[PDB]
Design a binder for these strands. Sequence first.
DNA 1: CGGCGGTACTG
DNA 2: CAGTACC
DNA 3: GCCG
Length: 324
Amino acid sequence: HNLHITEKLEVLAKAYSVQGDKWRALGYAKAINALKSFHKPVTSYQEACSIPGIGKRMAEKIIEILESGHLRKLDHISESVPVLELFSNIWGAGTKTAQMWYQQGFRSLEDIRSQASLTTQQAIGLKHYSDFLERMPREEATEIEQTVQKAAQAFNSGLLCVACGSYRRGKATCGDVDVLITHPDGRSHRGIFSRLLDSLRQEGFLTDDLVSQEENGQQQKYLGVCRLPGPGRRHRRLDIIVVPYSEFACALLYFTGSAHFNRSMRALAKTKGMSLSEHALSTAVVRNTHGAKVGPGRVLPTPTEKDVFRLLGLPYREPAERDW
DNA sequence: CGGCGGTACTG
DNA sequence: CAGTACC
DNA sequence: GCCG
Ligand SMILES: [Mg+2]
Ligand code: NA
Ligand code: NA
């Protein structure tokens, strides 16, 4: 339903997030995702508490709003939150850096540009501040995947390239492009990055690099910036991971998401004494009282996403049924 | 009381 | 290592 | 923040 109330909680959720109160912000995270997944809206301090994810304190405020239209917290929110959100929206900069800059008296991107000490990643983020905030129509996401897949098969017709993330989940727009590159023969994917990177660099397709350790042939991922030729083109974020065919499934699942999906999913295997990762699904995982993995385990074979759902006692769910 | 996902670069 | 990032 |  999307109640004007939850629309007032997200205002807080983001507040505690940017302020670095991850856990509390996480609490407001699921309580909102619940009120957003409600068939028809409620108006009782009880019926609400009933709803899974919504705790005592949560409903205590719901009343106030619905009931009133007022929310005490919203008015006592530090006049720092917006500036922290501004700063935190710079790629490479998080809550920690944001609070540091604010503490140093920084209040705008102007101030950041002239006086702030930036990392190479943040300098790039600031450079495309607006670009990194827009989404692209999926049609263009396709053109970018196609562009990488072309440069990939360009030297190995066996290379399998796919576009994951929100794309594979069937969204109209995309925040970036997440390309997965593997190889059925389980070996031909070895030490290829620089080949492709240098290829896409030839096409002038890549504009900037954020994360790319290529001096080490074991590089797993590439996060960078690209831009199609022609006018009206904007810079877009491009992520690329190359995994061996053996972990393809788990990689595909991971890269498809959503983020809340993998967390919730991995939390499930966690209970069943199992462990899931972009690499593989393990069973008989040894952990201590603090949930820390003390002993690895057996990597169950999983050549298809279905196998993962299956092994986790879960019914398969299409990429579109993962958008949560 | 205390976990809340599992992992890959950067400097 | 802490920070930040990918989903 | 919630929840075991
Ligand atoms: Mg994406
Ligand atoms: Na950021
Ligand atoms: Na991405």
